[PDB]
Amino acid sequence: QQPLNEEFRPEMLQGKKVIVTGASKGIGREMAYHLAKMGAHVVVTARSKETLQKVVSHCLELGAASAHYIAGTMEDMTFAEQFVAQAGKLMGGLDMLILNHITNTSLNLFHDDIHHVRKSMEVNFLSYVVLTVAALPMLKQSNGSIVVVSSLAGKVAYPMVAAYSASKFALDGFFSSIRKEYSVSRVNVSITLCVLGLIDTETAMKAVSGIAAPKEECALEIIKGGALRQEEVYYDSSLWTTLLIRNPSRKILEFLYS
Amino acid sequence: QQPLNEEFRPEMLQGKKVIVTGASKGIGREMAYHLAKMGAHVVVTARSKETLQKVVSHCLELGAASAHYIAGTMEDMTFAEQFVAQAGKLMGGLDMLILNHITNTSLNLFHDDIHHVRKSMEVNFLSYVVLTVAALPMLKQSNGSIVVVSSLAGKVAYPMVAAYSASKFALDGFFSSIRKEYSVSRVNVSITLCVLGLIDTETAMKAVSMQAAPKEECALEIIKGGALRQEEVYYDSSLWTTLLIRNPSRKILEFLYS
Amino acid sequence: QPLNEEFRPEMLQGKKVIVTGASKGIGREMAYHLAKMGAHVVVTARSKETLQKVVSHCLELGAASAHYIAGTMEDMTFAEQFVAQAGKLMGGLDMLILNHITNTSLNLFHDDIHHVRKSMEVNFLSYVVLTVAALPMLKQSNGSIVVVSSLAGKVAYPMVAAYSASKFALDGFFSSIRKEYSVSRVNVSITLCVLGLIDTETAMKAVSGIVHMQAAPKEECALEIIKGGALRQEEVYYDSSLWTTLLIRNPSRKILEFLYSTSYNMDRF
Amino acid sequence: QQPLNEEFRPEMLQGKKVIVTGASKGIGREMAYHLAKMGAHVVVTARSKETLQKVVSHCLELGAASAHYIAGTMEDMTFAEQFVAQAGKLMGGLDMLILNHITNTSLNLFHDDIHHVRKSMEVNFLSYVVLTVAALPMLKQSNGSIVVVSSLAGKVAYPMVAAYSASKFALDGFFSSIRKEYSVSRVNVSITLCVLGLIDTETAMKAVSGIVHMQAAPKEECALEIIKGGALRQEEVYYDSSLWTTLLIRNPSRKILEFLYSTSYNMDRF
């Protein structure tokens, strides 16, 4: 889309109505806290009821306009649908949908685990589509934004994360296609895809113990990208990563072909 | 993987045992016919037994070492699994698995069509994984090859094909990751991803009603790439397309990051 | 770094600008744009007769002043003396537009070392001499150098070997001194312009057949060069087709230059 | 051009007739030594007869079919032309021309040394053209090869090497253009451009002292990769301590656009 030709400021999120998924820990939790400090209305979700309550209480302490949680698993597509409808009622609308959750993923070779492939596709990809469809009427009303959190393994191939990579590549294909559609149909909803290197969440640090950028800063850069309506955000400890992983030729060919 | 350092010869397929899916029409049918002319053993599949019988009869006329069909839908993951077992039984093993079928797809904006997204992911992606898992023991025995048919819309973003693009991107992520795993684990099974522009199949010509490439030639280039164990085949009417769509920097970064 | 503003013609009002190779083609069009913007201009080329016509039209168009000095850029003494004279006449210098080339036609290289040498002297070395002569004045004004180059100064083509050598040399030289000015805190911008086929008389005599119809307008080309210089852009890419200007860019080069820059210690210099 | 679709073998250089310029020290000297070990005929040049004589002595001991030197400065285009003729006479022809010399260059900011700029252009660039013109008839006879030694600073920009970078960029523009001309004119002479990172020659090691702290690649290995690339008729050789450098500095998009652009124009004319 057309990004905002503006400097980010935290007041861009003041009073904005934001869903954050996968917000009980890791990057999602940090995004909830940043949003709370900016004075946003937030609804957080994950499976962990008790941790979500603690996240909500801290968001209120930090200055959230309001904060609520709804607990459930994004394996359940009915839950996903119902979640968005309830979150919208809790906030009186929706300005930004931050899709961040994933199913449990560790480093292993692919041997015959079709169940993990299916579960990864359902939780990491299909649930994002279901959430988007449920959110789109509200986002069209607010000229809002969808933020999709992805990965280096969603842009290039790695061993040991085959099922995950499939799901993150699928997000790029799906959301980059609907971005093109929203441009031609003049739907004023931005789509931001975030491509992350190694981030120091507990999940990642445990996953890479047998082989990191700060999660607070990562979370802020994701929000900034969404607020500025950027097509993509690249975040890593090293500029070697963020500068070289970019594929400007793809965007050029998409334009020239159109 | 390492591609064979030699020119293609049709004799490379003589007596080879090959599965072709989506082989009742389009590129799949043309691949069956080329394989037949080369004296391969072929097992073809699609949903329509009537059309498949016609393909088998023509394959035998053309010189196939043997030809059989098994009809079913790749919506049914049990069928996918049992199909590979039966095809292997019929031929006495498997040298090449050509994964080509897709669910019916036309050009349309995405609105609230979760059904098509799920169907596309199941038929176009998950069934390919199920088929690969079922085929891998036989392919390991033969040091064989997997050929995955994909698309320009599986490498860059287009409007009007969101569900389809998600599934084709997913293929790239998944199969490119397992390719990395087979290299580190020294599994001698090659994986070839084919990226196709507009090809003059009846399906395509109806869907787009620019220059369309001939399906006979397309089919042959797919077989050549698989036989030569190339990582990727790019095929289009124009060299502007096949040369510019390639992304060598991705392959370089994957290597550097390893 | 480039100015984060839209171009306005008032940015050149009262500015003191040299344009070389300005008797015809893109250089003449640049002089005309500058004149319309109310700049002070000094133009040069070998031919006094054609330069007279450019100066007279510049005055009609509303130049603050317009003058020519004729000479050949084969003569490095002329190059040096020309800048001193032009700057003294105008009372300073804000922009140096380096645009001239030696006469080049399309042909296979045929042992004509004389042409390789002449290309290197006129198209490349004279640009360096002009720059050295201008830099004190440009430092005084926090001014700009604009170097006009070519698609054949970024990728290789047959039939223009000597010319391409000279334009590649400009990129290597000027891109290196740009980096030096960054570390030495010299506030003089350098803009390298990469031009496709432009409908100058020279180009239209050189090319063949339908290629003539694939040329971009010289008036527009000239304005984009001036805009790039005024905005202190590092590079300007101009062509009749977006397929050209988008695909010919090599962003990986600037990325690697940046990534490589931390590994040397400039404190000695 | 089309590279040979085969693995390098040292016998590819046995009995071949090779010129190496700038061969009294550094990479050039190492190239002479590898060629000698492969049983090539070699003629080496540089300004210093004393250092050239030592190279020839070692080449003869290593097993060169023959080894000679001719001393002179490549500032003198007359010497350049006459050198190639004499080298050709000494060997009875020419199979490979390796152009490697440069004028003395150190790291410094550019101020006003137009003399250094001109000398760089004359020694590092124009003399290569003169040598090529002199050699080409012999190379056409043998379906031979030209190897042009260049630099990271001949592909991307660096401060402190402005005059040198201009000359190496010029080599790319010129020799890449002639490669295209040889393709349309059906001249069966290969051109290989070599792009080198930091190599542990005495010149480089002295020059970067205190400025740079990175790995330097071995000059012996560098020299061998240059010969291999030339022997295999490759368009470009990239050599560095790190695969990060050699893989990322290559620009396949340029080669693709040149090809696509060529399909649009008819070269029968001019």
Ligand SMILES: NC(=O)C1=CN([C@@H]2O[C@H](COP(=O)(O)OP(=O)(O)OC[C@H]3O[C@@H](n4cnc5c(N)ncnc54)[C@H](OP(=O)(O)O)[C@@H]3O)[C@@H](O)[C@H]2O)C=CC1
């Ligand atoms: N950290 C890294 O190095 C990288 C991270 N990323 C991306 O960043 C995002 C966040 O990663 P990170 O913070 O490390 O991950 P974490 O594991 O810390 O967080 C994942 C979140 O999703 C939730 N979640 C897990 N399963 C389900 C489910 N079935 N339904 C609903 N929610 C669930 C978790 O909470 P609960 O257990 O309470 O349900 C948790 O809140 C992911 O999209 C990921 O792909 C990408 C590349 C690298």
Ligand SMILES: NC(=O)C1=CN([C@@H]2O[C@H](COP(=O)(O)OP(=O)(O)OC[C@H]3O[C@@H](n4cnc5c(N)ncnc54)[C@H](OP(=O)(O)O)[C@@H]3O)[C@@H](O)[C@H]2O)C=CC1
């Ligand atoms: N033609 C083109 O322009 C392009 C083609 N491609 C790719 O090439 C491949 C072939 O395309 P094309 O030849 O045009 O397609 P066609 O529509 O001509 O053929 C599709 C085949 O798949 C079968 N099929 C459809 N649904 C199912 C199902 N549920 N289970 C099993 N088989 C099914 C069909 O048989 P039946 O209906 O009898 O089951 C048919 O045999 C596809 O992978 C596609 O993505 C990519 C880009 C462009």
Ligand SMILES: NC(=O)C1=CN([C@@H]2O[C@H](COP(=O)(O)OP(=O)(O)OC[C@H]3O[C@@H](n4cnc5c(N)ncnc54)[C@H](OP(=O)(O)O)[C@@H]3O)[C@@H](O)[C@H]2O)C=CC1
């Ligand atoms: N037109 C095109 O398609 C392209 C143009 N360019 C570039 O744009 C620039 C201008 O091109 P264009 O406008 O076509 O060129 P022109 O041939 O129209 O103009 C050349 C100018 O340079 C002068 N000149 C020639 N020889 C000398 C000399 N020895 N000393 C001083 N001046 C000399 C000429 O005047 P006089 O003869 O009286 O001295 C004339 O003023 C050039 O740098 C070129 O490389 C790049 C790519 C394409």
Ligand SMILES: NC(=O)C1=CN([C@@H]2O[C@H](COP(=O)(O)OP(=O)(O)OC[C@H]3O[C@@H](n4cnc5c(N)ncnc54)[C@H](OP(=O)(O)O)[C@@H]3O)[C@@H](O)[C@H]2O)C=CC1
């Ligand atoms: N080493 C490195 O890090 C890098 C090297 N390169 C390239 O590799 C090539 C070789 O470099 P390197 O081995 O370090 O250089 P050296 O300084 O070791 O060798 C240069 C050679 O050229 C000769 N030479 C110098 N001036 C003249 C002259 N006027 N006429 C004829 N010969 C002359 C020298 O001998 P004498 O003085 O006796 O004439 C010497 O034989 C060069 O082309 C360079 O650009 C590129 C990038 C990096």
Ligand SMILES: C[C@H](CCC(=O)NCCC[N+](C)(C)CCCS(=O)(=O)[O-])[C@H]1CC[C@H]2[C@@H]3[C@H](O)C[C@@H]4C[C@H](O)CC[C@]4(C)[C@H]3C[C@H](O)[C@]12C
């Ligand atoms: C750490 C690796 C590799 C990152 C990488 O490849 N980084 C760039 C190159 C770095 N190198 C040092 C190799 C070169 C740097 C050049 S430099 O010169 O700068 O040093 C990356 C690649 C795939 C990533 C996992 C997946 O996402 C899935 C999952 C998501 C969860 O949420 C967190 C857990 C997990 C397992 C992720 C953790 C981690 O994130 C992984 C392992």
Ligand SMILES: C[C@H](CCC(=O)NCCC[N+](C)(C)CCCS(=O)(=O)[O-])[C@H]1CC[C@H]2[C@@H]3[C@H](O)C[C@@H]4C[C@H](O)CC[C@]4(C)[C@H]3C[C@H](O)[C@]12C
């Ligand atoms: C035709 C378009 C666009 C192709 C394209 O973008 N091609 C390169 C650019 C060419 N230009 C526009 C630049 C022309 C200039 C010529 S020049 O020489 O200058 O380059 C492509 C993009 C997506 C493709 C569909 C999907 O796969 C899904 C589906 C698969 C079935 O199986 C067949 C049907 C269908 C609907 C496909 C048909 C067709 O295949 C589509 C529409």
Ligand SMILES: C[C@H](CCC(=O)NCCC[N+](C)(C)CCCS(=O)(=O)[O-])[C@H]1CC[C@H]2[C@@H]3[C@H](O)C[C@@H]4C[C@H](O)CC[C@]4(C)[C@H]3C[C@H](O)[C@]12C
């Ligand atoms: C015309 C060619 C090629 C341009 C090119 O490669 N352009 C992009 C690709 C275009 N395609 C092939 C894709 C066709 C698209 C046609 S489309 O209509 O679709 O756009 C370019 C390449 C080198 C150029 C000459 C040099 O500078 C030297 C000299 C400078 C003078 O000052 C003017 C004269 C002259 C002889 C120049 C003329 C012209 O400028 C040349 C021949």
Ligand SMILES: C[C@H](CCC(=O)NCCC[N+](C)(C)CCCS(=O)(=O)[O-])[C@H]1CC[C@H]2[C@@H]3[C@H](O)C[C@@H]4C[C@H](O)CC[C@]4(C)[C@H]3C[C@H](O)[C@]12C
């Ligand atoms: C050393 C630098 C920079 C090299 C570079 O940019 N290399 C790639 C990047 C590597 N990184 C730092 C990113 C990673 C290394 C990780 S590491 O573990 O290694 O620290 C390069 C760039 C330009 C080079 C000079 C010119 O040619 C001219 C001249 C030629 C002579 O013949 C030898 C002398 C001299 C002065 C040359 C020496 C040296 O050659 C220079 C300074």
